[PDB]
Structure formats: C-alpha cells, structure tokens
C-alpha cells in the first residue's frame, strides 16, 4: 500500500460535531501530490489485477457475446426513416438513414471517424422535412457540446456552429426554418436559432437571472402550433409548464416572451402527450404518485379533468399518442412492463398486452405515424425491435429486427421474480437469474446489483458480461429493486430518500440475507455492484454489514455526503440527499456517509473474524459529474483505517481503485471488475 499523506489540521464544526477531513487535499485534481496518488493507486491496482488470472478469459467471452449486429428503433420524419446501427464491436453506434424500412441504409454521421470514437452521439435531431440533421459533437473530454447541422440529401455541413450546449435537444419548428435549443451563457436559456445565421443572432425566449439553478427542457406539439418550455429544479420529479402559441405571433419568432404560464410551480410533474387545438392531454403525478393522464383546455386553464385515472397498483411510466387518435400507455406492474392501447378521446381501454420479464422502451412514434416501433431487452433476450401496425393489425406484435448472441443457448438459464421482506416489513421485488436446475446448497458465487434513488427504475436488461458470469462462473445474478427508485411510484421514491435513505441500504442488505438463507449462496461469496448513487449504496452496505460480502465494486460513487453539494452539479442532488448546511439534514447524512463511517469490524465484540470484502473502487481521474475526490477520499480512508494504520492487519482482502462511452474501453472495465470478482470469491472458470 502506497503512503498517502494525512492533513491532521483539517477539522470542521457541523452544529457542535467535529469532523476531521484528513484527505481534504485530494479535492484538487491538478496538484501533483494528487496525480501521484492516482499513479500510486494505479501501480497497486495493476499489481493486484495481474494476479487475477481470469481477466483474460472474461475479456474474450464478453467480446464474443457482444459481437452481433444491433439495429436501433427506427423513427420517421416525412418519408425517411432514421435509426442507430452498430455491426457489433464498433466504438460508438452509427446514425443511419433509409428511404424505406428494408431498403439500402446510408451512413449519415459516423462518430468512430472522430477522436477514435471516444464519444458517441448524445444530441441528435432530424427536421420535419427530413432534410436537416442537427447533432452534438464533444470538444474534448468535457461536458460541453458543439451543435452542427448536416444536410441529409448530400451530407454537407451548414456553416452554423452553436457553442455552449450540454443536454439541450434541438426542437424543430414545422416550417423547417430553425429550432429551439437551450444553451448556457459564454443560467441556462431557451433560444431559437434560424438556419443559416450566426449564434449571436439567436432569439432569446427565456432566462431567469434570479433562479440560476433552474434548468430547462422543451418540446413542440405534434401539430407545430405550440412551443412548450418546461422548467425544473434539481432532480425532483416536478416541473413548470409554459406554452407559447406560435400561430399567434404576428411576425413569427422574428418578433422578440409572452408565455401562457399553465403551471407556475414545482408541486407536480407534467409531460404533454397530445393536443387537439388548445385542448391538452398531460401525464402528471399531481395527487397521483403512480401517475395518470389529465386533460385541460388552455383557454380555461383552471379546470383539470382525469382522462385515464391513477391505478391503485401500477406506475404509468410513459404515454404516447399514436395513429391519429390512440394512446399507448407503458405501465410498470411489479417491475414488469404492460402496454395498453386506448382511445385518445375517451381514455377507454381497447387492448392490454403484458410483457415478459425484461423491458420495453424507446417508443418514438408520433401522432401521425400508424406503425409503432419499440425495443425489448432482457437478461436472456439481447434485443428485439417489435412493430405494431395499428391500422392493419393492431393486435399482433411482429418481430422487426432480432439480435442474436452467438453460441449461447438461453434455454440453459432462467429468470424468476421473487419478493423478499426488508427490516421494516416492506416487500422488495428482486430478479434472480441463474442456470436451470441448480441446487440451493449455498455454494454458488453471487452478484447483486442495485441503485436506490432519484426515481430511477432498475430494469432487468441485457448484459453480455452477465451471461459470462452465469455460464462461465456458475454464477447467480440478482437485480434488486430497492426503495428510492420509482418502481412503485413517488411513495417508493420518498421512502428511500432524505431522512429515509437508510431504508435503501436495509432493503439491499435484506436481499442479500434472502439469498444466503434460501440456499442460493452464502456470506462472503456475495458480490455487490452499483454506479453513481449505487456506488454510495455499495459503500454504505459494506460499512454496515461487511460480514455479508465477499466482494464489492463501487463505480464513480458519492462518498462524502457532507460536501458532495459543493462540487460541479452535486447541488442538484440535495432533493434526494439533504444538505449538510442544515442540522436536521446533517444528522441523516453523518450516519451513513461512506468516508465518515469506516470502522474496523474485527474490533466489535463477537465479530473478530470479519473483514471488509475485497473492494474495487472504479473511477475516472477527471469526472465532471461525480467528482472523483469522492472515490479517492474513500479509498484513502479505507486503506488507512483498515490497512496502513496497523502493523499486521486482519484486512487481507485487497482495497484498490481501478482508474480510467466507447465499447472496448467498456469491455475492459467490465472484464477487470469480473476477474477481480472471480479471484475475491475464490471461484473457478467453467
């Protein structure tokens, strides 16, 4: 273990509680001490990882199982079709364009010819006439994006260059004269950019100098008449809704804004699904934690009427207007999708298609499209694009494209959903994937995955590496739908955030206890994983019950819950986490904050034989979202408290960081994490 300096004079007073921050100096990523820290950790990691002799066999199996063609869900503009393509091992997917669903495709933009395919396409937008394609190119490693515009007819670029963009989409007016987008100043703004002009000429539509932390999404109605600005605070599921009637502008957008402020508060989420003239249909969580559809006339905006009411059980996840006058409602019922077809006008049920364990998503049909396309993936289904022609065969889901994994028989394996009790009684859904007919004799290595926050729903999607775990390591995989997610609506999210964040860790721990008890595995043969907020998850559980885990892998997680809010965009995470500038909130945080809760378990009575599991902390050296200081400080603390502070520590399990989104880069991370896992669980290859 490399020596790491401790600044013993850094202490802070949080409402009378003293907290030392020995590793405060690691909060600066450009000091040479800090770079040296990285290099020394990298030397240790690599040293350890050579010992992990299955890394090379994982790498090739992942590579072999990923090497298959993948057509993405096609979308239509005018009479052209557009979709993403990857022949199997390309670094980034490729945007392609076609005249007909099964005619010759044409490459439209290929990110692999730029910076080695370091980054792929994040913003992409085709105009209504299909003649223009506005896409987002990254400059360096940084969050920032430049918007350029290609002509689809001949793939020539417009001179137009829009800087200072991040997550904004390009939303085209139906006149094909330009698009709305949402940049930051050289305080996000809503702007309109006329094709063929300089960014300096772009029309300002909205800014709020008084509320700089508010950020924006926007949309344009399927008829082209209304531009909708959404305004959000933090990561709450809640937003404003302003509307601008573009037909009532006397000189188009060149005039200039006078928004009809339909919803001017953050009480509820609102998404627009459809409109007939001024009569709008929204999806909302207003008085309906599991969501519902409502209808309101903008010319009488006070009167809201339910159109499809809130289900007593199921989350209404999204909704789409299709085929002139229908709705497809995507429900999540016990973390399983259910698609309903309904009449747009009456909200009456017409058809109800349950879906197998797995996930459907990417429904991009628009109101005038009569053919709907969506993608289905599962643990043992690599990816199916289904098509439903609502006109001519509304009932049958026909297969449009079908990915096949080479040399993999899915009939060897199975997937079940079972429900397990948590500390406070609550039932927790979990997904267990493994080989058919196995004995529940406690012998199998086991990998458990979870997230636990921000209303994110964890779906059992396809991972190739996971097949390799199942087949070539005789493994059992568990995806755990703990609270803090949005799987059971807003009450599910609220029962695992702020003052109740602890429940999330308790839910995960219980899922592990279930798998130990039912004979799937045993303590010390369990591996946990999770990224970002699920790195926080992993870190917290191994502090509280290190006895349960053989291995642990936290990817760019949030570890200093006292100071997370001070860095890059961490301030938008205070809705979920609390903020340590408030006593009540400080007190939630201090109890579970990873870097402040590393204690030697062998010093606890009746617990002398317990050590932290083998831990890999995966992180970049320069991450713009979850600043790596988090991971470094945790690494620093663990290594200190459990290894370097003692002469001959019981902590034999290694504590390392792996230090680095392109395909082969991604396979390397995953093959490493899996080999490390194999060595930690003492598990042989099959």
């Amino acid at each position: 273990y490399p020596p790491v300096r401790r600044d013993e004079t850094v202490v802070d007073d949080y409402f009378g509680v003293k907290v030392a921050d020995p590793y405060r100096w690691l909060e600066d990523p450009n000091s040479e001490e800090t770079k040296e820290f990285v290099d020394n950790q990298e030397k240790l990691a690599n040293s350890v990882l050579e010992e992990c002799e299955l890394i090379d066999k994982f790498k090739q199996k992942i590579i072999d199982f990923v090497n298959f063609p993948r057509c993405g869900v096609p979308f239509r503009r005018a009479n052209k079709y557009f979709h993403f393509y990857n022949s199997g091992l390309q670094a980034q997917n490729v945007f392609q364009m076609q005249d007909d669903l099964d005619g010759k495709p044409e490459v439209l933009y290929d990110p692999n010819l730029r910076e080695g395919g370091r980054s792929g396409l994040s913003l992409y937008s085709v105009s209504e006439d299909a003649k223009y394609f506005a896409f987002g190119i990254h400059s360096g490693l940084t969050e920032w994006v430049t918007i350029k515009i290609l002509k689809t007819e001949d793939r020539s670029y417009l001179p137009d260059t829009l800087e200072w963009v991040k997550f904004s989409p390009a939303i085209w007016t139906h006149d094909n004269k330009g698009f709305f987008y949402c940049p930051y100043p050289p305080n996000q703004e809503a702007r309109y950019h006329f094709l063929g002009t300089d960014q300096s000429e772009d029309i300002l539509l909205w800014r709020d100098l008084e509320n700089p932390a508010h950020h924006l999404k926007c949309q344009i109605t399927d008829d082209g008449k209304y531009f909708l600005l959404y305004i959000l605070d933090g990561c709450d599921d809640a937003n404003k809704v302003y509307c601008l009637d573009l037909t009532k502008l006397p000189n188009g957008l060149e005039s200039f804004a006078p928004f009809m402020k339909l919803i001017d508060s953050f009480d509820a989420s609102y998404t627009a699904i459809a409109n007939d003239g001024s009569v709008f249909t929204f999806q909302t969580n207003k008085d309906a934690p599991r969501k519902k559809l409502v209808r309101v006339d903008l010319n009488n905006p006070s009167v809201w009427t339910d159109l499809v009411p809130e289900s007593k059980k199921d989350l209404l996840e999204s909704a789409h207007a299709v085929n002139e006058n229908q709705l497809i409602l995507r429900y999540l019922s016990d973390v399983k999708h259910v698609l309903e077809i309904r009449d747009l006008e009456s909200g009456a049920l017409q058809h109800r298609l349950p879906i197998d364990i797995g996930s459907v998503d990417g429904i991009t049909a628009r109101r005038r499209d009569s053919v709907v396309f969506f993608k289905f993936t599962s643990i043992l289904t690599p990816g199916i694009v289904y098509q439903c022609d609502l006109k001519n065969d509304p009932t049958q889901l026909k297969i449009f494209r079908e990915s096949v994994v080479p040399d993999f028989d899915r009939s060897e394996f199975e997937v079940k959903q079972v429900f397990v009790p948590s500390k406070d009684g609550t039932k927790i859904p979990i997904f267990i994937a493994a080989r058919k007919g196995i004995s529940l004799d406690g012998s199998h290595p086991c990998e458990m995955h979870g997230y636990g926050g921000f209303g994110i729903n964890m779906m059992p999607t396809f991972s190739a590496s996971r097949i390799v775990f199942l087949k070539h390591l005789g493994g059992v995989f568990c995806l755990a739908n703990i609270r803090g997610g949005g799987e059971y609506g807003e009450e599910w999210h609220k029962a695992g955030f702020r003052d109740k964040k602890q429940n999330v860790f308790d839910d995960f721990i219980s899922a592990a206890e279930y798998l130990i008890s039912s004979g799937y595995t045993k303590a010390r043969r369990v591996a946990i994983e999770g990224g970002s907020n699920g790195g926080l998850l992993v870190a917290a559980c191994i502090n509280q019950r290190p006895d349960l885990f053989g291995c642990a892998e936290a990817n760019c997680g949030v570890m200093d819950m006292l100071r997370f809010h001070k860095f890059t965009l961490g301030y938008l995470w205070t809705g979920d986490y609390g903020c340590s500038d408030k006593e009540e909130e400080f007190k939630w945080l201090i109890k579970y904050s990873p870097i402040h809760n590393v204690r030697r378990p062998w010093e606890q009575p009746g617990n002398e034989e317990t050590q932290y599991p083998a831990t890999m902390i995966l992180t970049a050296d320069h991450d713009d979202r979850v600043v790596p200081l988090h991971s470094f400080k945790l690494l620093a603390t663990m290594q200190h408290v459990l290894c370097t502070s003692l002469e001959d520590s019981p902590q034999k399990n290694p504590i390392i960081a792996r230090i680095q989104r392109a395909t082969m880069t991604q396979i390397a991370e995953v093959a490493d994490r899996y080999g490390f896992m194999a060595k930690a669980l003492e598990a042989p290859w099959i």
């Binding site: 980034q92 990816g383 190739a464 590496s465 991604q666």
Partner: peptide, 6 residues
C-alpha cells in the same frame, strides 16, 4: 445510445 450491451 449505449454502444454495446456489455
């Protein structure tokens, strides 16, 4: 737009 289901 993930590049591969790894």
């Amino acid at each position: 737009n993930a590049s591969a289901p790894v």
